[PDB]
UniProtKB/TrEMBL annotation, chain B:
One cellular component (GO) term of this entry: plasma membrane
Name this polypeptide is given: diguanylate cyclase
Species name: Xanthomonas campestris pv. campestris (strain ATCC 33913 / DSM 3586 / NCPPB 528 / LMG 568 / P 25)
GO BP term (any one): cell adhesion involved in single-species biofilm formation
Signal peptide extent: none
Binding site for 3',3'-c-di-GMP: R17, K49, N52, H57, D61, R83, W84
Keywords (A to Z) from UniProt: Membrane, Metal-binding, Nucleotide-binding, Transmembrane, Transmembrane helix
Domain GGDEF: residue ranges: 36-156
EC number: 2.7.7.65
Top EC class of this enzyme: transferase
Molecular function terms from GO: diguanylate cyclase activity; metal ion binding; nucleotide binding
Chain positions recorded as Mg(2+) binding sites: D44, D87
Organism classification: Bacteria, Pseudomonadati, Pseudomonadota, Gammaproteobacteria, Lysobacterales
Length: 153, 156
């Protein structure tokens, strides 16, 4: 399906781009809060080497399925590509971040998944590209400081 | 005709992933059997994204094209360059480690038109070591370079 990743059923790259545009438009038109997360796996390659790529595929599927487990009606999760994902949550930073962190903590428990993540909060007067740039930059700070963490913009 | 479409990356003209895997296999075999030296490099760009952001993807495409183009400018007749995918590349050099490494650093210095920043890792083929293992060593070395600040080459 267009806009959807065949393996995980999360949105695909073009799905992510459209979702970001629609979520930012919604925040600015409906007044809804919006937090964008950029996630990059830290240990999928070693999981693939140790248990095989099918095990790795399962890990990605689990990641997305479990996310759909707490994401709301207007929320979303998309696969940017490879082992990199984006998550859009229409809630306060407090709520969004607490749920995301608890979710990531749960995933560190069958092959444990380690994730580097960054977040950015939608604000009036910002466009989707700039929001993405902020969340993306935060993710790299998380990544290079060791991973297995969420750094806020 | 068939092979070229099956083993080469259309955009850059470097080998594609299938080509990288077959090139690594052949290079290790030649090293283990024919006895010549072989050094494998794993490279990952550090600053391509900002280039796309301000200049567009066509400009970024040109960066990848120039990278491979310049490589073919010094690579030997039996050496090779492949695109693992995205902005990640592998280079196979059938020469002694010193020669291979010196040639690579000289090339990366030249690239550092928009300047290119690259994280690189190398591994040398030795008896008892297969292609998958050689790749793992070079790959791990690249990651050490990347997390140490990038724009450098780390050896296994
Ligand atoms: N398997 C797979 N993974 C994907 C795909 N799209 C995105 N990713 C994953 O997401 C990361 C960042 O992608 P990006 O934001 O487009 O940021 C990219 C992009 O700006 C640039 N880049 C990569 N390939 C090309 C290309 O063919 N043309 C141009 N202009 N830029 C490229 O380099 C940046 C980093 O690339 P990576 O290190 O590979 O890191 C990539 C990759 O791990 C995909 O279609 N398939
Ligand atoms: N655009 C593009 N880029 C490519 C492609 N193939 C490789 N790359 C680039 O090369 C990096 C390492 O790829 P890998 O060795 O397969 O190592 C991969 C792989 O072991 C795993 N992975 C990614 N996607 C999948 C998947 O669908 N299934 C499984 N089992 N593992 C995956 O995560 C590792 C790192 O992925 P990345 O962070 O994305 O980082 C990727 C990506 O930046 C491609 O077809 N298209
Ligand atoms: Mg990744
Ligand atoms: Mg890369």
């Amino acid at each position: 399906h267009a806009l959807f990743d065949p393996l995980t059923e999360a949105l695909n790259r073009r799905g992510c781009e459209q979702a970001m545009r629609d979520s930012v438009t919604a925040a600015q038109r409906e007044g809804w809060p919006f937090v964008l997360f950029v996630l990059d796996m830290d240990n999928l390659k070693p999981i693939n080497d140790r248990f095989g790529h099918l095990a790795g595929d399962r890990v990605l599927v689990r990641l997305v399925e479990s996310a759909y487990g707490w994401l709301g009606a207007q929320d979303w999760i998309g696969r940017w590509g490879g082992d990199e994902f984006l998550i859009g949550v229409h809630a306060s930073e407090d709520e969004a971040t607490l749920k995301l962190n608890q979710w990531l903590s749960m995933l560190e428990r069958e092959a444990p998944l380690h994730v580097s993540a960054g977040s950015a909060v939608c604000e009036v007067g910002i466009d989707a590209t700039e929001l993405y740039r902020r969340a993306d930059a935060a993710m790299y700070r998380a990544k290079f400081s060791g991973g297995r963490r969420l750094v806020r913009d």
